[PDB]
Amino acid sequence: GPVVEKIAELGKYTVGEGPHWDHETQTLYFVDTVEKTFHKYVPSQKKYTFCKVDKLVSFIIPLAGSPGRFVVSLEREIAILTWDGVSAAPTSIEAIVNVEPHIKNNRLNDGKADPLGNLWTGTMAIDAGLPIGPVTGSLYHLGADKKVKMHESNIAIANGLAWSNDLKKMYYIDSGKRRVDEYDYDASTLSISNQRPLFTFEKHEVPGYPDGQTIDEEGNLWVAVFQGQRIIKISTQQPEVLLDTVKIPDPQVTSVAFGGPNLDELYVTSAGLQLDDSSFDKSLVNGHVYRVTGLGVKGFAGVKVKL
Ligand SMILES: [Mg+2]
Numbered sequence: 001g002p003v004v005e006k007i008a009e010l011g012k013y014t015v016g017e018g019p020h021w022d023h024e025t026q027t028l029y030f031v032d033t034v035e036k037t038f039h040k041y042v043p044s045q046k047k048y049t050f051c052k053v054d055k056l057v058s059f060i061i062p063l064a065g066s067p068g069r070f071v072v073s074l075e076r077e078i079a080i081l082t083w084d085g086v087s088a089a090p091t092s093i094e095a096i097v098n099v100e101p102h103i104k105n106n107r108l109n110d111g112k113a114d115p116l117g118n119l120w121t122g123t124m125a126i127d128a129g130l131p132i133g134p135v136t137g138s139l140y141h142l143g144a145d146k147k148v149k150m151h152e153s154n155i156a157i158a159n160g161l162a163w164s165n166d167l168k169k170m171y172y173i174d175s176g177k178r179r180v181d182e183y184d185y186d187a188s189t190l191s192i193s194n195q196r197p198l199f200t201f202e203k204h205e206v207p208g209y210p211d212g213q214t215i216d217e218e219g220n221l222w223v224a225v226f227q228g229q230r231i232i233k234i235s236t237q238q239p240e241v242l243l244d245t246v247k248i249p250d251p252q253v254t255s256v257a258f259g260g261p262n263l264d265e266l267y268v269t270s271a272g273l274q275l276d277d278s279s280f281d282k283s284l285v286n287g288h289v290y291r292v293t294g295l296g297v298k299g300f301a302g303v304k305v306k307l
Pocket of ligand 1: 211254
């Protein structure tokens with residue numbers, strides 16, 4: 001019986017997203033895509049701060065070796081944000097690369113560093129829709145040479161990413177496909193190949209859409225289910241195996257990250273934005289942040305981007 005706790009200190013988010021646990025400073029970072037804000041929460045000291053920008057944002061990841069600098073998305077730009085962690089505006093922003101300069105109605109969505117510190121992230125139409133909408137996105141990684149390489153195309157809603165502990169596989173979610181895919185991942189060349197479905201929602205009566213994901217020390221995936229009011233735990237040893245379900249009060253669960261001193265607390269973001277064709281009445285759709293404990297598994301600290 002896991003225990004799910006609403007973090008009252010944090011309030012309500014329109015689309016809370018992109019949780020990142022920095023273990024060295026025991027700090028959780030996350031974003032609100034639609035409200036154009038970055039957020040910082042220090043649980044041990046009950047400290048909460050935010051930063052405002054004027055572009056759509058989708059991730060915030062500390063830069064390796066540079067305290068107070070972060071790699072972030074600003075619409076289609078990957079940028080370095082210099083932020084003191086407390087002032088409401090950044091100190092400076094420096095663009096690294098625009099991934100799609102000539103696709104004006106796209107944006108970056110989910111992004112994460114692979115275990116080697118390479119940033120992987122995908123794009124999507126700003127007006128992407130569920131269950132059907134424009135399909136214009138692609139999946140990229142950024143090299144330490146500041147050039148992007150494309151790995152996948154025809155993505156509707158570029159979402160959660162994770163890598164196996166032995167660095168042989170990569171897991172990926174296009175929410176439009178309502179499944180989690182697995183790929184063979186070559187750490188030497190950074191190539192992915194042999195795409196196959198790992199877990200298909202329709203085969204297991206799972207409502208909603210997969211969104212963010214993370215992996216634990218046992219190699220199982222924890223997947224946020226947007227419009228499913230839950231997180232699910234799924235096997236990576238065998239396809240199509242649902243291991244557990246944990247209900248979250250907010251229906252629009254968006255993403256997940258392990259954190260806390262012992263890396264055994266699961267932080268969970270959600271979205272209060274009410275969409276058309278929701279399966280839930282508006283009084284239920286709030287956008288709180290949750291902490292889940294007693295899962296009996298640990299995960300890994302967030303990886304910094306090397307760049
Ligand atoms: Mg997402």
